[PDB]
RNA sequence: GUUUUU
RNA sequence: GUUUUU
RNA sequence: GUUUUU
RNA sequence: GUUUUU
RNA sequence: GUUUUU
């Protein structure tokens, strides 16, 4: 029998830092001891909040639309500032810009906060443009875009990734942009996502009782295929 | 019918009207827990009898069986019953060389001794009782050296030889149960009594179950040197103990016509 | 079908014996049981398994500290003065705040002061200085049950330090039990 | 030897432990108990009032707002847990003699704080018609936004026994008879967090 | 020892019977050996004591009797005496 | 439950603590004699109706043959 | 030390934004002598349920 | 039942030199904690 | 599931003498800490 | 509630 | 990715 | 190299 | 030597 | 004594 040998507790060795507390892995934080009762969980409750299941993943707010550089009033500079709200009119010409300028994620309301959060990021980005006219201005725009350019200037769009917008019954035009940059993840709030060109294509026509001039709205989203992934310090603080 | 029929009445016409959402009503009948009832308890020789009794009530999750499961006493549960029973102390006296064939030592009276003093394990119930019917084991202990000799005649004799004393033949109450034990032989006697008297029972308090007595069957011949205090003792025993009549505290209280 | 006792109408003389789970019911109600964690909060095990405060003591030397222990009439601890009787594990947490030094710990029930001169034959687990223990002293009662009340309900604990210089410093303790036995419940009690 | 004792519950006269505080929270216990009755007609906390031959229906013979700590044995978990849930029982005994007669009606008003009397119509009441069982109870069933509530927070309600039939007698009984209301929690009481104290006992 | 410490009205937390006059003209109780010690002193009230308190005082009408008596009375379930002593002397049983 | 619950309890309890002599205590609880009954009797063209009745009597071993 | 406080709250749902969103903390120190000094706080969630997504924040 | 002893977390014993730092074996440095997320 | 109850990292008691290095047995010393790559 | 991890 | 170790 | 221990 | 514990 | 937990 093992009785040749005195019987003893087990010796261990610590490794180094003992009593280090760890606040960046989770598979650590939920580890950590419960100053519950008897260490127990509770039931959660949704219906009071409407909802059939919590939410688990962030990245599908990160897929919800918001306003770029939203302003109460429209652009007044004929559209070539960042603010997502412009006007387009029967006075510009074609091949006239209604809109023009540098494309950043922190120019969206939704976006704006995962650039606070995270480092680096990947994935198509989603841009719809929402004119609003009546049932009798008819006309087209086509709004391109330059993935990753940096000179704010009017250029021809032939050869960057566009849309050409025909009024009609669904005035809601959309834009994908695929991920485009040397790295296989970029920084969240780095180098531009390019140049945002929105160009008259045919002058909008109207009538005795229609307006000669519309309004614009340019929301933002991340596509289906968006992914964040470090998460860093904070550049600015919310309220 | 009525009026003890109105829970189902108002119950099923609530019921046939009822709708989608269900019945608006519902009645029930019955009788109020305080009914009319009569609770008859009975103790030991007593009887509470109670026209208007209330739900006994009691702790809870009690355990009434009163037996300590530790033994933190560690004696048999009816110690406190047969302790009555129990061997006492009746009697001790000193024979005196001097005395002569035939003489009384000593006497205990019979039953009554047992409670000769408020000392007596006995003495307790029997103060509670007035008739008495049990049976005796004596053991009449008498210590003598060696070097001397003797014998003494140990017998019980019932109220009827106590009554008539005298008239009777000393060298023939060897027909009584006794123990003619012969000094520097035996130290003690044994003598198992059953109730004997002309009567069922006997007043306790009473020596109508006759006594034990001690004679001289032959001095005492106690050598020069020897010693000379021999003391003789009566210890008695409860083969069988019964306690009937209940009476006041030690009132004397007359069993016989 | 519902009685009408169920109802309401009752008789107060007629609860005994004590204990009676008698459901009430009205047309629109029933008793419904939610919860909400995944235990009870009220179960002896669980709230008493939870330590409370008791007291402080202020060392300026080795002399021994002996102090009686009994029930809280000021925590959570409370709830137990709805019962008379106790008897159990007994969990005892002690904090020795001081700079360099050991504390003696030991807890017995016997009410004689001399048993504890002695200490290391009833316990004495050693807390360095800085340190904090919590020892299970088990129910080594001469009695069977501890009243529940009683200035000494639960065992006196003992406290010695063996300090090295001038080092002074302070003792505090909380007490938590097991698995406690509660017996026959008496009336609440007051407030101050 | 980190060993266990053999408990003995005989000695306490049980045959098992208590293991549930919550049982305790079920047992009755006199609201605001006071050595006199209501000396103001029993519109204050005194669950110890009096009804009489004088007051007429619809008058009041008891109004006040009830909270946990009103209640002995409550008060203590009041003291002890910070949260609760589940329904409340209130037991109103009249004691009378077997010769009075009349009806009272008992209401409550879940999670009311004005302290006023008011009609019973659309509270939860229970009306007590004297006869040989003169203890009447009433049922609260849990009424609050939270799925568990304040042990020591918003009023449990506005309770309010008003006399609905004058209390009738004769020439050798009572025009007037004492009154008993006591409290206890329904089988589904349940108590949750243990917080710290707001009283001290003794 | 600890009675003006507790609450009355929550006495009823205690074996009981609260008995309403007029109804019950007698109470049942049944209580077993309860103390923190196995055995109790004989000649003691160490096993504590029974009361009887006012719960609602007597509405006594004018021409109605006014002399009500209360009477205890006292039945042994299970007894049993162990300790042997000499009579009626004081004898320690506890520590 | 109650007040007609008490010979049992009484009965069992003292039941349950009974040792070798026996139980200490019995209990039985039953309806009085007295009853709350009404009865009624009719002769030729009669009705008697009473409320309060009690045991009928009769002499022993009767013969109403007559 | 890293303490996982439960979900004892006496509101089904913590509104995210409150002053008082999370419970309250408590920190009392058993000091011996004159020390003196400063308590870090820094606080994380073991398995977070949030409903009913609101609009953007702004910026200061 | 194992209900004669009063139920207990483990005690062990701690090596020598507990909290030292082997910077010397990969067996030891590739077990260190990650500050992933 | 055990689902009612957090989970947790063991919580372990530690012996007298942490850190104490045993310098009288073999099976203590053999089984050291390796410097080797 | 795979709501530590597979 | 046996990319801790077999 | 059972050269940690069986 | 179940002489840590079952 | 499932009286750590299932």
């Known amino acids: 029998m093992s009785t040749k040998y005195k019987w003893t507790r087990t010796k261990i060795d610590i490794a180094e830092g003992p009593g280090s507390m760890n606040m960046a892995n989770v598979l650590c934080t939920t580890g950590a001891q419960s100053v519950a009762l008897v260490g127990e969980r509770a039931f959660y409750d949704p219906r009071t909040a409407g909802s059939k299941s919590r939410f688990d993943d962030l990245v599908k707010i990160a897929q919800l639309f918001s306003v770029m550089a939203d302003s109460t009033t429209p652009s007044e500079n004929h559209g070539v500032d960042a603010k997502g709200y412009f006007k387009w009119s029967a006075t510009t010409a074609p091949q006239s810009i209604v809109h023009r300028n540098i494309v950043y994620l922190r120019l969206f309301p939704n976006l704006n906060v995962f650039v606070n959060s995270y480092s680096y990021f990947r994935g198509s980005l989603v841009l719809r443009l929402s004119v609003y006219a009546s049932t009798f201005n008819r006309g087209r725009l086509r709004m391109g875009f330059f993935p990753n350019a940096t000179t704010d200037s009017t250029s021809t769009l032939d050869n960057a990734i566009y849309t050409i917008c025909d009024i009609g019954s669904d005035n809601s035009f959309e834009i994908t942009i695929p991920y485009s940059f040397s790295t296989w993840m970029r920084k969240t709030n780095g180098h531009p996502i390019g140049l945002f060109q929105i160009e008259v294509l045919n002058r909008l026509t109207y009538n005795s009782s229609s307006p000669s001039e519309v309004y614009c709205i340019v929301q933002g989203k991340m596509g289906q295929d968006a992914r964040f992934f470090c998460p860093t310090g904070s550049v600015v603080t919310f309220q | 019918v009525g009026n003890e029929i109105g829970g189902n009445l108002l119950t099923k016409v609530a019921d046939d009207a009822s709708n989608i959402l269900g019945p608006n009503c519902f009645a029930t009948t019955a009788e109020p827990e305080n009914k009319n009832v009569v609770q008859a308890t009975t103790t030991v020789n007593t009887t509470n009898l109670t026209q208007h009794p209330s739900a006994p009530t009691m702790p809870f999750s009690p355990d009434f069986s009163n037996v300590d499961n530790f033994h933190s006493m560690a004696y048999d549960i009816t110690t406190g019953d047969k302790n009555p029973s129990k061997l006492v102390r009746l009697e001790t006296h000193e024979w005196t060389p001097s005395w002569a064939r035939?003489?009384?030592?000593?006497?205990?009276?019979?039953?009554?001794?047992?409670?000769?003093?408020?000392?007596?394990?006995?003495?307790?119930?029997?103060?509670?009782?007035?008739?008495?019917?049990?049976?005796?084991?004596?053991?009449?202990?008498?210590?003598?050296?060696?070097?001397?000799?003797?014998?003494?005649?140990?017998?019980?004799?019932?109220?009827?030889?106590?009554?008539?004393?005298?008239?009777?033949?000393?060298?023939?109450?060897?027909?009584?149960?006794?123990?003619?034990?012969?000094?520097?032989?035996?130290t003690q006697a044994d003598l198992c009594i059953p109730y004997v008297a002309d009567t069922n029972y006997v007043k306790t308090d009473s020596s109508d179950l006759g006594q034990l007595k001690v004679y001289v069957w032959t001095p005492l011949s106690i050598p020069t040197g020897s010693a000379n205090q021999v003391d003789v003792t009566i210890l008695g025993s409860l083969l069988q103990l019964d306690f009937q009549n209940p009476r006041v505290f030690a009132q004397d209280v007359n069993i016989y016509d | 079908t519902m009685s009408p006792n169920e109802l309401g109408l009752t008789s107060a003389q007629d609860d005994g014996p004590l204990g009676q789970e008698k459901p009430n019911y009205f047309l629109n109600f029933r008793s419904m049981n939610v919860d909400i964690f995944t235990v009870s909060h009220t179960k002896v095990d669980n709230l008493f398994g939870r330590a409370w405060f008791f007291m402080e003591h202020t060392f300026t030397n080795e002399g021994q500290w002996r102090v009686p222990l009994e029930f809280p009439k000021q925590g959570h601890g409370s709830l137990s003065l709805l019962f008379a009787y106790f008897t159990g594990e007994l969990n005892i947490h002690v904090l020795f705040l001081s700079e360099r030094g050991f504390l003696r710990v030991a807890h017995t029930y016997d009410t004689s002061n001399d048993r504890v001169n002695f200490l290391s034959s009833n316990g004495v687990i050693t807390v360095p200085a800085g340190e904090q223990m919590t020892l299970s002293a088990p129910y080594y009662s001469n009695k069977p049950l501890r009243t529940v009340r009683d200035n000494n309900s639960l065992g006196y604990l003992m406290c010695k330090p063996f300090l090295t210089g001038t080092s002074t410093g302070k003792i505090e303790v909380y007490l938590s039990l097991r698995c406690p036995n509660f017996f026959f419940p008496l009336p609440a009690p007051k407030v101050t």
């Open chain 2, 102 to 186: 035939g003489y009384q030592i000593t006497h205990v009276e019979l039953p009554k001794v047992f409670w000769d003093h408020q000392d007596k394990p006995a003495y307790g119930q029997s103060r509670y009782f007035a008739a008495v019917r049990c049976g005796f084991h004596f053991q009449v202990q008498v210590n003598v050296n060696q070097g001397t000799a003797g014998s003494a005649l140990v017998v019980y004799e019932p109220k009827p030889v106590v009554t008539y004393d005298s008239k009777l033949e000393f060298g023939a109450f060897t027909n009584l149960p006794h123990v003619l034990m012969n000094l520097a032989e035996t």
